[PDB]
Nucleic acid binder design. Sequence first.
RNA 1: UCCCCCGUGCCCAUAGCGGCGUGGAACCACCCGUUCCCAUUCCGAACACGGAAGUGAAACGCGCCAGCGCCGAUGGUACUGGGCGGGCGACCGCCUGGGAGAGUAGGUCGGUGCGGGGGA
RNA 2: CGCCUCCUAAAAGGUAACGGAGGCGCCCAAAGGUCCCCUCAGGCGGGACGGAAAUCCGCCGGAGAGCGCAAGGGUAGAAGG
RNA 3: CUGACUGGGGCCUGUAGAGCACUGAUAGGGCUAGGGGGCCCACCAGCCUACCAAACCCUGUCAAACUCCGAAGGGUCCCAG
Lengths: 203, 110, 181, 116, 53, 141, 69
Amino acid sequence: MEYRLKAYYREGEKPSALRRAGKLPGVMYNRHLNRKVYVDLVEFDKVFRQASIHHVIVLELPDGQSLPTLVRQVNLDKRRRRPEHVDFFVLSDEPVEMYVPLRFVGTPAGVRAGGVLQEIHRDILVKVSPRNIPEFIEVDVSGLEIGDSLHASDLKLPPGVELAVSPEETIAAVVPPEDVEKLAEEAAAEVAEPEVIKKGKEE
Amino acid sequence: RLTAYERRKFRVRNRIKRTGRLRLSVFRSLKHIYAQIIDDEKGVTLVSASSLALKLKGNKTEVARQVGRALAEKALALGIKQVAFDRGPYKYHGRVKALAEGAREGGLEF
Amino acid sequence: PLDVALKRKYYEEVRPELIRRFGYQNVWEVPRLEKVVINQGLGEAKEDARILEKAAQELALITGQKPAVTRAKKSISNFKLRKGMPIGLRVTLRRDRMWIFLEKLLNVALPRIRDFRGLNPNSFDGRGNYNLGLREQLIFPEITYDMVDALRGMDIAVVTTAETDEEARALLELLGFPFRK
Amino acid sequence: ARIAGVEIPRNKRVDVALTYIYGIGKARAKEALEKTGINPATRVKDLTEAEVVRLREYVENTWKLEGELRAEVAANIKRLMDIGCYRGLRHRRGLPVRGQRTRTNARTRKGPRKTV
Amino acid sequence: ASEVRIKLLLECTECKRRNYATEKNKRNTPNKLELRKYCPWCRKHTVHREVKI
Amino acid sequence: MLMPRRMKYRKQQRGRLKGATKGGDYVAFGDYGLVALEPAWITAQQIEAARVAMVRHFRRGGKIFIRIFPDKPYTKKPLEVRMGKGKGNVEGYVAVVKPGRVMFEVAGVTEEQAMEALRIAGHKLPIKTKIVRRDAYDEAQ
Amino acid sequence: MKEGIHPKLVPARIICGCGNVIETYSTKPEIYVEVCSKCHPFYTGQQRFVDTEGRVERFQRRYGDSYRK
RNA sequence: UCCCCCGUGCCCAUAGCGGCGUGGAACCACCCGUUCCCAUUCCGAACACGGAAGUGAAACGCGCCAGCGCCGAUGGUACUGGGCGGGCGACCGCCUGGGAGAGUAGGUCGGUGCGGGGGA
RNA sequence: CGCCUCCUAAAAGGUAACGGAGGCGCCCAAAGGUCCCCUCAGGCGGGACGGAAAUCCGCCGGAGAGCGCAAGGGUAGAAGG
RNA sequence: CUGACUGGGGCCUGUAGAGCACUGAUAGGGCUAGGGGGCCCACCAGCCUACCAAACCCUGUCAAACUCCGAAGGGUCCCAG
Ligand SMILES: NC(=[NH2+])NCCC[C@H](N)C(=O)O
Ligand SMILES: [Mg+2]
Ligand SMILES: [Mg+2]
Ligand SMILES: [Mg+2]
Ligand SMILES: [Mg+2]
Ligand SMILES: [Mg+2]
Ligand SMILES: [Mg+2]
Ligand SMILES: [Mg+2]
Ligand SMILES: [Mg+2]
Ligand SMILES: [Mg+2]
Ligand SMILES: [Mg+2]
Ligand SMILES: [Mg+2]
Ligand SMILES: [Mg+2]
Ligand SMILES: [Mg+2]
Ligand SMILES: [Mg+2]
Ligand SMILES: [Mg+2]
Ligand SMILES: [Mg+2]
Ligand SMILES: [Mg+2]
Ligand SMILES: [Mg+2]
Ligand SMILES: [Mg+2]
Ligand SMILES: [Mg+2]
Ligand SMILES: [Mg+2]
Ligand SMILES: [Mg+2]
Ligand SMILES: [Mg+2]
Ligand SMILES: [Mg+2]
Ligand SMILES: [Mg+2]
Ligand SMILES: [Mg+2]
Ligand SMILES: [Mg+2]
Ligand SMILES: [Mg+2]
Ligand SMILES: [Mg+2]
Ligand SMILES: [Mg+2]
Ligand SMILES: [Mg+2]
Ligand SMILES: [Mg+2]
Ligand SMILES: [Mg+2]
Ligand SMILES: [Mg+2]
Ligand SMILES: [Mg+2]
Ligand SMILES: [Mg+2]
Ligand SMILES: [Mg+2]
Ligand SMILES: [Mg+2]
Ligand SMILES: [Mg+2]
Ligand SMILES: [Mg+2]
Ligand SMILES: [Mg+2]
Ligand SMILES: [Mg+2]
Ligand SMILES: [Mg+2]
Ligand SMILES: [Mg+2]
Ligand SMILES: [Mg+2]
Ligand SMILES: [Mg+2]
Ligand SMILES: [Mg+2]
Ligand SMILES: [Mg+2]
Ligand SMILES: [Mg+2]
Ligand SMILES: [Mg+2]
Ligand SMILES: [Mg+2]
Ligand SMILES: [Mg+2]
Ligand SMILES: [Mg+2]
Ligand SMILES: [Mg+2]
Ligand SMILES: [Mg+2]
Ligand SMILES: [Mg+2]
Ligand SMILES: [Mg+2]
Ligand SMILES: [Mg+2]
Ligand SMILES: [Mg+2]
Ligand SMILES: [Mg+2]
Ligand SMILES: [Mg+2]
Ligand SMILES: [Mg+2]
Ligand SMILES: [Mg+2]
Ligand SMILES: [Mg+2]
Ligand SMILES: [Mg+2]
Ligand SMILES: [Mg+2]
Ligand SMILES: [Mg+2]
Ligand SMILES: [Mg+2]
Ligand SMILES: [Mg+2]
Ligand SMILES: [Mg+2]
Ligand SMILES: [Mg+2]
Ligand SMILES: [Mg+2]
Ligand SMILES: [Mg+2]
Ligand SMILES: [Mg+2]
Ligand SMILES: [Mg+2]
Ligand SMILES: [Mg+2]
Ligand SMILES: [Mg+2]
Ligand SMILES: [Mg+2]
Ligand SMILES: [Zn+2]
Ligand SMILES: [Zn+2]
């Protein structure tokens, strides 16, 4: 979909003051503009948990302007697991690199056999027109056993969208599951002591 | 990847420029020979001479020698006397050597 | 530059067929021979009798050129090898002696090889050069059974200006190199 | 590598020398020197060069020798070992081939005795 | 210095005075060192020869 | 259980434990994570008890990701000796863990399965913990 | 070339057994060889020195058809 | 003073790798030779000399391209001089001044000094 | 138990513990002076005996080789050959 | 009048933090020599692996004796209080 988010301008307000008033600080940029912004945290969080660098967010500004952006970067407070700053990338008419959600259709035969589908990439990096952004990219994984894998070279891309990663990059795999029957093997598995790399006259 | 040519040139010339004298640089093409006296502190050439610019005759070795005399005569009229010879990538031999001998005959001190 | 039949065959016959087979637009683009490097990795003379001068007297008769000593890079215990030890001969043939050697090589030497069935078509550099080894040195017309003492072969590198294996296959085959496949 | 690729001994008679070739025995030595009219008692050191290539020519063109003979004998042992017949099995194991007893002897085919 | 790497003196062969002390490896260099050196008595260069220290 | 196969040095100084975790603060592999809420040296024994507790709750199925590794040698002098006479002997290995670090992630399993396995695992560790689920914030990292 | 180290190359005859003679260069002015490219069976087409055999076995027997049909 | 080339410096990859294209009148190179100077642990490959039929194929120079490499903000954060608080501790905060690294936007297929030859 | 190298050492210098790791008590007549020349390890392909690795050839390869010996600094525009 | 301390200016530095380009460590996946095992075989090859796994790549990390980076400060000289 196409989400909307009120944004506001900030000059010399201190980020800790804005964040204490419930406002997430941010920035807007492309080759033409660079402006210090802030959004409302609860408002931004409602949108971002859905939009999430994948779908377009339109920023309604206080001067009346509206600008179509991709979230380019989210900085998290490593202690509290909270966003502390956003980068809004203002889209132009030229193509753009971006991540399109991968969507894994079907149940693998390995998963039926007891396995686990490891979704290695959940989106994929890609150049596409900002008027061409597909909602997702379907991938058939129903023929993967334990342990087969899928790569970006197996992506059936919609029209207008070019792969921006190496075709040899792994996107999914189906791996063996955890098994209690292996525990007693691993428990009674003696692992020898670490070797210390020879130093000096002995090497 | 430097060539043996570029290594030879750098090696010869670093040693020359360490002594702080004006260098007599010499470029030897298949056809012609050239000379500049260079102040490396200013990065500036003070006096030149070459077969191409004097439209000189046939035998490359005697041509080289005459180029040296020519360089000397113009050098002394500017006050230049002492100098350091910059064989660059060439052996001190033949055409280069002749140009050096020709410079010395003209009173360049080296 | 001497008049040698192989060199003349290169210019008169070989070059025209190469220009026609590949359509070169510059005369310097047509494949030619750069050098022929002969190597004896003797090593059976390391310490024993470093009187490989026997072999140097041989290669000098074969090529008209005095080969030069190869010395061991590092020391190798299993090969019984001390760094710096003399372990063979390399002689680099260019211009008329290169032609003069290759001339006798194709006419006389290769035919005298035991159970000869043609040069190995797959021995090409991947960049347009070729290599072949020899099992003996009596193969050559100058080295007679009388003068010989031991059976010493060699490596032969044939370096061309061709950028690809196909152009080099063309040039060598045209000069008279007998390939089996 | 005179004839034929084997540098046959000088000092010895021609019939005797040519036996030092894979494929030429006492029988074919008589055949080569008659068919080229060479005294069979002449030492190899005394063959006129005309005689040599005369002797060389007939020998190499008439009979399979050295490598071609050896490749052929091998090719026959190979095909016997591929078509899986009984003689082929005996060549597969290195055992004798012409029906001999193996409880004892057969040391030529088996090699020197292996202890137990 | 050791048993095989000995100390030694260099003696000016013209005036016989010992002008330099040095060392060598008498296994590697069993012959007596002959070297040109300045002799300050003769006030010129001179063949000096190894002499026991 | 986990420990380096080789090392350049047998014994490490103790260092400090200040600050939030350096990296590894977002869910990178599985669907749910167990986040450290306070610093500690987590022992190789503790990680293995945490891993076994999750394997046993899953019985058969699922995938566990262990995102910390005990590479720091832990040293203790022999009992009843005095101070001095050199550094103690290596008795074990620990992983340094600071607040915000995602220690374990699980995948291939229901939400109720993951919540409960990460809870039992957390009871084996010498620190308070949080259970998290992969977010858009995790994906944008 | 350096002096006094290289064997001098002079014009040379090479006489093969097949009468072929090559005008080349060598350290020896006249050499006799037993074979050359002009007569070697690999060179001179499919000159099968002897075994122009074909199959040869395992059917050119045909001794005979006397068994019935 | 403008454009091309040859020397020779400076900045120190925004200057590099790769791909493609282009240049021989001039210059440069390959080139033609190995008598002469000089030269090869063998080799005129190199070094060197004497040349001038050819070719810009190689090299070099000059363009174009952002796949790699190189450079890289703004914003925010870590950390912190100095000043204060809190916690039994491991450790955690506030003020004031300073402020990265990673990453994002983006930049880059160089710029410039001196002399020499040619051109307009 | 003297001496050298690194760390501890809190970005000048210095800095302790029966703190963490290694080395020295030699050597070289060239392994020294100077002049001239040369450039590595490694990867791939090719080559008789010949091999993971001997010697040869081609392409890639800025320094990961080398520098008598510990470690560190330095270093091919050489301190290496 | 040169001092502690302070202003400005230059130069020196490798810590905090961070990073992974070097030296090592490292979980998983991919790719993939070599082993384990399984069909098939001895006639020398061939296929298969939910096995261990080098190199390489991706994702994600660790380091007093790691550093492609790198502060705050500190040191020192000049002029001024
Ligand atoms: N220059 C400074 N403000 N330094 C503050 C040091 C950190 C301090 N202990 C804090 O977390 O608050
Ligand atoms: Mg919230
Ligand atoms: Mg040592
Ligand atoms: Mg030509
Ligand atoms: Mg090939
Ligand atoms: Mg080639
Ligand atoms: Mg012969
Ligand atoms: Mg016989
Ligand atoms: Mg019987
Ligand atoms: Mg029987
Ligand atoms: Mg401590
Ligand atoms: Mg503990
Ligand atoms: Mg402890
Ligand atoms: Mg202690
Ligand atoms: Mg202890
Ligand atoms: Mg422990
Ligand atoms: Mg942590
Ligand atoms: Mg707990
Ligand atoms: Mg990251
Ligand atoms: Mg000479
Ligand atoms: Mg001479
Ligand atoms: Mg230029
Ligand atoms: Mg300048
Ligand atoms: Mg390209
Ligand atoms: Mg070009
Ligand atoms: Mg021209
Ligand atoms: Mg023209
Ligand atoms: Mg001469
Ligand atoms: Mg003359
Ligand atoms: Mg030449
Ligand atoms: Mg030249
Ligand atoms: Mg000419
Ligand atoms: Mg060109
Ligand atoms: Mg062109
Ligand atoms: Mg050049
Ligand atoms: Mg552009
Ligand atoms: Mg920089
Ligand atoms: Mg950056
Ligand atoms: Mg900033
Ligand atoms: Mg403080
Ligand atoms: Mg405290
Ligand atoms: Mg602050
Ligand atoms: Mg501030
Ligand atoms: Mg910093
Ligand atoms: Mg930055
Ligand atoms: Mg560029
Ligand atoms: Mg310039
Ligand atoms: Mg100019
Ligand atoms: Mg001009
Ligand atoms: Mg210190
Ligand atoms: Mg220190
Ligand atoms: Mg210090
Ligand atoms: Mg002091
Ligand atoms: Mg003590
Ligand atoms: Mg000791
Ligand atoms: Mg010496
Ligand atoms: Mg190599
Ligand atoms: Mg190889
Ligand atoms: Mg082999
Ligand atoms: Mg090899
Ligand atoms: Mg080194
Ligand atoms: Mg005062
Ligand atoms: Mg004072
Ligand atoms: Mg001050
Ligand atoms: Mg740190
Ligand atoms: Mg690393
Ligand atoms: Mg990285
Ligand atoms: Mg740390
Ligand atoms: Mg760290
Ligand atoms: Mg440290
Ligand atoms: Mg550090
Ligand atoms: Mg970078
Ligand atoms: Mg930087
Ligand atoms: Mg500072
Ligand atoms: Mg300090
Ligand atoms: Mg200061
Ligand atoms: Mg002070
Ligand atoms: Mg200051
Ligand atoms: Mg004052
Ligand atoms: Zn005296
Ligand atoms: Zn013939």
